[PDB]
Amino acid sequence: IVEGSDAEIGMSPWQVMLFRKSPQELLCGASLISDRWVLTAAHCLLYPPWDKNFTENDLLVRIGKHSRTRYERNIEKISMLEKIYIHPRYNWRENLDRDIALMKLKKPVAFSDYIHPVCLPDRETAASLLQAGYKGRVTGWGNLKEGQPSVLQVVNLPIVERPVCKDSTRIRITDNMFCAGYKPDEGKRGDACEGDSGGPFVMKSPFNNRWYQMGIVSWGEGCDRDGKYGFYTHVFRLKKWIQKVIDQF
């Protein structure tokens, strides 16, 4: 995150870290959606262009973390994966369209003060909240500038108008994406960066005061660049796919 702040203790109980055995290093961010399911961006695991292609065996999940690099002794719980599910129609070739994947832990985590699942949106919900001007929140242990934080960062960015998004890049933007961030003539700034992908973009329902995952950190051209905006997987749009994998499996 760029232009964010230190997250408060237990502020994002759903925040997960994608971590690799050898070499021990932070792959991406992710979210806890249930006791056995984690939701990240598919490009975190599959990206041929960079020869990136992770299998269940190369990863560990680190849940309930605050410190980026420390092994938080009696707080964090590290999980192994049973199975990974990338969306059959994720377009890694052109525009990371449908940049989403689901992970099945080998054993369900037990919740606590630091570990707690976020809510998936519903039609009514996404319909009320995914409005230009409305603020959401991204968290992550990503790069600070386009070095690294000791602690989880957080920033609140506004949903931008579809057009503006479109006119901000040469990339072909689809219905499965939304952009967020401040426009150049607004003052405030901030964005996600390398090591933030797979992390959640969350809004708090003004109706039931519950937290929902409306998006997944997908892409952007640099970080906190003026006249640029952040790109996220539109989670509601891909919901039936998720359900399906939850059902099936």
């Binding site: 070499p23 021990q24 290093e25 980026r68 690099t69 092994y71 590290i78």
Partner: peptide
């Protein structure tokens, strides 16, 4: 790397 070993 910057990382602390895990159990």
């Amino acid at each position: 790397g910057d990382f602390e070993e895990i159990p």
